[PDB]
């Protein structure tokens, strides 16, 4: 039982790693900008 708990924890670690990398790829790929941060005449 203890050995299988070690295997389960390692598999949960690699799964959370895959999810984290999918998140960083999504954040890099799709981008949004807050309006208050744009120079005033540059907004439209």
């Amino acid at each position: 039982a203890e050995e299988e708990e070690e295997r389960r924890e390692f598999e949960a670690g690699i799964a959370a790693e895959k999810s984290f990398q999918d998140k960083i790829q999504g954040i890099l790929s799709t981008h949004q900008v807050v309006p208050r941060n744009i120079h005033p005449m540059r907004r439209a």
Partner: protein, 51 residues
């Protein structure tokens, strides 16, 4: 929080800024060429009046 902690976001933001500033420098280059043409035609009008 995740956006601030992240690191490849702060990597790619530089490329965003640098491509933007290259395009806007190209716009300023076209404006400078326009101003040079304006001073050329002003000189030609003074040449006409000297004649």
């Amino acid at each position: 929080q995740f956006r601030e902690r992240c690191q490849e976001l702060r990597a790619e933001l530089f490329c965003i800024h640098q491509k933007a500033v290259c395009e806007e420098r190209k716009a300023q280059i076209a404006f400078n060429e326009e101003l040079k043409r304006q001073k050329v035609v002003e000189e030609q009008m003074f040449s006409k009046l000297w004649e």
